[PDB]
């Protein structure tokens, strides 16, 4: 049996997704400390979904940046490198600018079954596509 190669080691992909989602979520918690009493339970879940889907649709953009950092290391990369880079993305995207738009313009998405499915996944399992 042939083995289909992966385009990024699974553990490396997992470190990126865990750290990006964790960082986006940390900023959502700080934003909800201020605004959470003005949002319904389903609206708050929709914003958690927004975090995961934002990572998914910006994945290829992040990979371009990650790969330049990896090429600059001067050695074989290891999982810790992807943890550090995913945490940097997780902290630097100022998602509250988007939360403010969604709240202030009454644009928080209607919460749907597929969104709850994505929220209930482990970050490690959230699907990404390489392009």
Swiss-Prot record:
InterPro entries: Egg_lysin, Egg_lysin_sf. SUPFAM superfamilies: Fertilization protein. Gene3D superfamilies: Fertilization protein. Pfam families: Egg_lysin (PF01303). GO terms for biological process: single fertilization. Keywords: Cytoplasmic vesicle, Fertilization, Signal. GO terms for cellular component: acrosomal lumen. Sperm (at protein level). The keyword Signal applies. The keyword Ligase does not apply. Its main location: cytoplasm. It is found in: Cytoplasmic vesicle, Secretory vesicle, Acrosome lumen. Monomer. Homodimer. Molecules associate into dimers and then rapidly dissociate again. Interacts (as a monomer) with the egg vitelline layer protein VERL (via VERL repeats); each VERL chain can bind multiple copies of lysin. Creates a 3 um hole in the egg vitelline layer through which the sperm passes. Does not have enzyme activity. Species-specific interaction between the sperm protein lysin and the egg protein VERL exposes a basic surface on lysin that may dissociate the egg vitelline layer via electrostatic repulsion. Plays a role in ensuring species-specific fertilization. This is Egg-lysin.
